[model samples]
Target: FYKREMFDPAEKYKMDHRRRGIALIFNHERFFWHLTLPERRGTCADRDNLTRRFSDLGFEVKCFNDLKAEELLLKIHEVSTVSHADADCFVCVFLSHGEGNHIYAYDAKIEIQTLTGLFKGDKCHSLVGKPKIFIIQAARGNQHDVPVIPDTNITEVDAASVYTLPAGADFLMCYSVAEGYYSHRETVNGSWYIQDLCEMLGKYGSSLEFTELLTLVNRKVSQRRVDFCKDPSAIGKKQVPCFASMLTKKLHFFPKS
Candidate 1:
């Protein structure tokens, strides 16, 4: 069991979830004209690992690759519309090049929140009370981001605030880096953030709290090192994942109590 120190005092978790779903989107768009040459490798292997990891947690993992922004948005719309009948927890992962407010596709760019907000108001009503978690691994800027000690009570997008939307759920937007900063990649496999996330998730996902999971994610990305844009001082330097959770019910991948 996790000590009281591990759990969020403001959050009441029932530790029960009967159904869950995971959607993964990886955009290795070879269309960036700036890359006159062929595309380099990414840490997509980490994504594959993430799928299996969630599947083991009983999530029906939906994955998409090499898709344009519209295709990706369509998928999000479809999933959000399915309501709770087909899913309980909603997790969407994005591996793409991005800026503060946008993510790049093969042929276009789109606001990240525009696609996610579809679940609000008259949009995907079924997923309202469900947990909407987006795990995005992308660069928010053109420079490397740094890591620092942070307030444990901090939630960039208000993860603890309760929402009254008929959709009946909260949201968690987990970005690889904070706004106005660049995320990191291995130039050989994938991004440093993802490698650490997958590693940590594989080890603690089923047994740890979400914040607990990310704390280790933060730790690994902040401490681990590699060559070729993978340095302890620069990689994951400004990564502080966003979460907008308004969860009103209990959702647990593993029960520790």
Candidate 2:
């Protein structure tokens, strides 16, 4: 359990700058005819929800709808080249179709690394020690997670490593589902992950530590089921969102005070 009264600023990312920073949302819906990608129906709801939520958190929200691969890269590259000297952090969100290590634009696919690499310490100097957050809401593959029986007699536990390296520090990469799994979306309600994420952000964005809030989102999303899927393999499926955090400190978006 965490006690906010005992919070230490030295161990947390400094989020007090002239600006909270930019929240760039890439919403890909319709695809080119040649790509044969089905239009993402509920993505607009996700984009709007994110814009409102991030804006409430004091970010300068920018939304891009259905850009081609080249245009998408060019826009992000433009953002990367700008100085973030007066900003507290940076955020980018992707709502599109994807496969392992790649995300699709309107016309073609792009390597995920090519997008994130633009913000590395050597590339974006002003943001080197600030948080660079990326949230991905896309399927890594077409696989579904079937229901499983849990063993009440034994509990599972995992251990984590503690090491420090500067190359990729201060970054958080959030995925809507674990690797090689399908991400769920409702025609009217948007993605299972983004829905829960926005809910948590609205409820706890300013009070709780960012990662702790994400844990709540993880729990909320995993508890949902695909009760009405036409595909037998997809019905009753589950999704578990995950995050890779390279942040060396706790992150909080406390109201600019």
List per-candidate RMSD values in Å: 10.1, 9.4
Window of ten residues with lowest summed lDDT in model 1:
153-162
Please give the lDDT score for candidate 1: 0.58
Query: What is the per-residue lDDT of model 2 for residues 1-257, given as tens digits with 9 covering 90 to 100?
Result: 76687756658788889999999999997777666556577788899999999999999999999999999999999999999999999999989877656788888888888888999987999999899998988763222322332111111111111111122688898878774344677666788889899999999998899989989998997787654524446654557778888888989999996
| Stretches > 4 Å off in candidate 2 | 1-10, 140-167, 228-233
- Candidate 1 clashes: the total is 17
Summarize candidate 1's per-residue lDDT along 13-77 as a digit string, tens digits: 44344565556556463444532212324545656777777787777777677677678778777
Error of 1 at 156 (Å): 26
Each prediction's TM-score versus the true structure? 0.71, 0.84
